[PDB]
């Protein structure tokens, strides 16, 4: 949007967060999508225990 940048504006996840007994945020980074090859290119995997 004129800046030649991508910027978050929508954050619709909760109307309230009453009692936060744990909180964390990482050190910041600049997220982007860059570099191309045309086939489906990335597998991502997560295990949660």
């Amino acid at each position: 949007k004129n800046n030649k940048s991508w910027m978050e504006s929508e954050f619709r996840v909760y109307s309230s967060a009453n009692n936060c007994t744990f909180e964390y945020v990482s050190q910041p980074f600049l997220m982007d999508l860059e570099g191309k090859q045309g086939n489906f290119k990335n597998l991502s995997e997560f295990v949660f225990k």
């Binding site: 007994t21 744990f22 909180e23 964390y24």
Partner: protein
């Protein structure tokens, strides 16, 4: 907590929660700033370990 600019009135005493961090008492029990420190179910000497 100890160094806060303003403290609460006891009729409305603040009850703050602490977590995700390290409890270093060295600038605390060993420090001149208090005319009383009493512990009641630990030795203050043990608060690091």
């Amino acid at each position: 907590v100890f160094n806060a600019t303003r403290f609460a009135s006891v009729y409305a005493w603040n009850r703050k929660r602490i977590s995700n961090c390290v409890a270093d008492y060295s600038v605390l029990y060993n420090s001149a700033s208090f005319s009383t420190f009493k512990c009641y179910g630990v030795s203050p000497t043990k608060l690091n370990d």
